[model samples]
Target: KSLIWEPRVAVSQTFAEIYSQCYEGFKELCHLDSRFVPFDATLFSAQSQEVDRTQTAEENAALDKRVDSFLHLVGSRLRLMPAIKAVEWLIRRFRIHEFNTGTLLATFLPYHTIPAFVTLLSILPVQRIPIEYRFLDPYIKSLTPPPRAAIVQQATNRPDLLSAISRYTLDSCRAKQEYPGLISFWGGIMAEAVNGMIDKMRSGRRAIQLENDHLLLQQIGPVLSEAMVMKDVPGIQIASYMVVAILAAKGSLNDNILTAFMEQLVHGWTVDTLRPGLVCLTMLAQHRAKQLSGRVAKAVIKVPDLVSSLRDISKEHQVDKLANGLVLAFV
Candidate 1:
């Protein structure tokens, strides 16, 4: 949620509301790079930027008439393009880009954060505006804390071309350098919206789980340990452990990771009630205790309130008399 802002009351008015509300929440975005693409938008739109078209030649030809210098810059250097170009290009492309930009703003934002761009553009007094790669740096340096701190600033608010920035992050972060075709299929924001069923699916892929590793030393590591003297605690590990544990608490009793501990335990529980069965039970008990200890460390453990913990274990395994013998062994 850090890199993105969401409206508390509603979704419809989003970019739609940006105009009426003005840039009230733009502050979160204020500190971000003008070139930064929004996470949500990138997941979908990058594909649109690439593949140029499975679209017909007629539309492409018609689009030729529509291609102005600014759109041409983004169109030509499509891969290097960032949010500013997309946003600015739309404005340059005419009212149609306005619709697309509005849709784009709507893609991940209040999009009500919307009207401000069209509104801002409405008063511009210029028919079309031009943007350049150099313009960003000069304007960025000319001003302070900002996206040209004006029109260009809105670009920072738009998603950059993931096609340009995708996975190119670390040593192996990029595709070995890239994958234009695969990303083309993503269909990003709305794609996620209908399918975005985000969150877990996000970190769930063969991705980001590792992305955090790099960010850890520089990104996630310090926050967790700044308070702990050992600094032994890492953010990603804590994040995963807490997430799995909490989600587990929402399930039916023993219908969770508790079931995992039971892995092969049921078969092991009987085993002709043979010596192998006791061998199995002993290991099961041993790790159960170890698992319990880790729970205490991560952090909790407790009183005889759980005196029945063993009972439940015994009853579930249909091994009361047997388990009691083990408990006697414990005492």
Candidate 2:
């Protein structure tokens, strides 16, 4: 399908100049009839194949050179832009048929545009991984100290972005009937939020700052709930610990909130769900060892089956061991 051409304000001199220089190459690479063969199979069609088509030595060398040069230009010149404009740029570029548009944009945009691409990912409706995304693995991996750091740093400040990530990931997980690679990526993002909260606490920031922070209400609430419903064990662990970390730092665990948390753990008794729930329990116990003894002790004692199951379950797995430890600690 053809995209409607709309005028866009230039985000940077570099963006405009790069577009001017590379527009012809971009068009050719994305052309319908005479397109690059690899792109034709992956971008223009949905049919899956065992392996990508091979190119001759000369052809392979030329395409490699072309792809490398294009990416190099983008990575070197891209600069940070406002969130709104950054999202707009991503949506517009993704509308183009060329697979490289999305891949290159995803691979390079975060380097220059803060974490707006993450926000964009959240806003876009959940769907299967784009076929053209296959070629993006190396580029995504190449994002190490510089661009990756920028992405994580931006994620810490954007609770809306984190909330969207939780929703998008859960929606996709439901649709796919399993997790996607993006889950691990978003897990890292969540870790950054947790670390940021910890840093604020260490700096002696007021509890109101952490309370005002939308991560617990907006991000962790949905993530923990969805992960439980989906039986996403790793997500359960990450989000649960993050919740404990935030509350520990802020030093504000209200009765109503603890009750709600206990309620979730009540449903988390099975072998699959027991570990993260117990991990959170351990952290809570550690913090409120004496102060919250009555409340915490009451919650665990009521869930005797969960406590019993933890003891019976294998202790081989690390999480299982943690589960056993929580049982011992709480009881």
lDDT (C-alpha, whole model) for all candidates:
0.28, 0.44
Query: Best-fitting candidate, measured by TM-score?
Result: 2
Per-residue lDDT tens digits for candidate 1, residues 95-164, read 3333233222222221112333333333232222222112223323433222222322332222232211
How do all models score by TM-score? 0.20, 0.44
RMSD of each: 20.6, 14.5
lDDT by residue (204-291, candidate 2, tens digit) is 4567545654435555665765564455455544555555545543535544555455555545445554555555655544343233
- lDDT score, residue 254, model 1? 29
Clashes of each: 22, 0
